[PDB]
Design a protein around this ligand. Structure first.
Ligand code: AMP
Ligand code: MG
Ligand code: MG
Length: 225
């Protein structure tokens, strides 16, 4: 039987203009949006900013694209501290123990790039609970049967006859819009399910024809020795 909760995560990260290929991203915003699959309502939202430690000064391009200011990241906890809190929130809403749940992200960068890089930077083991997720862009592409380029957030909203609510590149607002699409897709009868994973630190697909399996209750990973 189906997930009780979909847990939507969409990060914001440091960046440069022109998107330089060798620039080391760090997570600067870690939102969580909890969607109850039964009531189809967004039940919980939590926002937290993260303080980068490598490239600590946000670029102008970044401050403007995301809206996040230096004073915000400066006053924020470091990633491991923020992760402990996200895990504590998840533990509070009893995910993995009382309720069957799954992660959902918009694309495959949040887990396989941003969280992946960040854990290396923070010297953390990659948290098991985040090794499998629902990439909604993929879900959408397969459900409505459109090429990959048509699954950009902008187009998904447009084609479903919806609007972008709130600020672009603000992770919380982004996550909420994502959840709003999830709802709509569930309503259109699409069974959202895990379709992507990490394996040997590489992005890999996951068979869509296999039974619904909950994500394990989250734990706080240790520091890599
Ligand atoms: N146009 C862009 N140029 C460079 N980096 C970007 C751009 N759009 C998004 N990103 C990176 O991806 C992160 C999250 O993407 P988004 O979900 O589009 O806000 C941002 O915090 C940026 O670090
Ligand atoms: Mg994103
Ligand atoms: Mg975003």
């Amino acid at each position: 039987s189906y997930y009780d909760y979909i847990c939507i995560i969409d990060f914001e990260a440091t960046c440069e203009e022109g998107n330089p290929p060798e620039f080391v991203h760090e997570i600067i915003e870690f939102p969580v949006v909890l969607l109850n699959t039964h009531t189809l309502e967004i039940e919980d939202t939590f926002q937290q900013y993260v303080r980068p430690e490598i490239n600590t000064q946000l670029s102008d391009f970044c401050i403007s694209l995301t809206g996040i200011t230096q004073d915000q990241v400066d006053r924020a906890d470091t990633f491991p501290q923020v992760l402990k809190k996200v895990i504590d929130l998840m533990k509070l809403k009893e995910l993995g123990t009382k309720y069957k749940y799954s992660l959902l992200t918009d694309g495959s960068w949040d887990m396989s790039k941003f969280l992946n890089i960040q854990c290396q930077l923070s010297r953390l083991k990659y948290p098991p609970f985040a090794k499998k997720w629902i990439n909604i862009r993929k879900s959408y592409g397969n459900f409505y049967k459109v090429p990959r380029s048509q699954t950009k957030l902008t187009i998904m909203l447009e084609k479903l006859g919806m609007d972008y609510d709130g600020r672009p590149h603000c992770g919380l607002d982004d996550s909420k819009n994502i959840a709003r699409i999830a709802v709509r897709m569930l309503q259109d009868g699409c069974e959202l399910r895990i379709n992507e994973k990490m394996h040997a630190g590489q992005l890999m697909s996951v068979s869509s024809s296999l039974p619904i399996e909950g994500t394990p209750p989250p734990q706080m990973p240790h520091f890599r020795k």
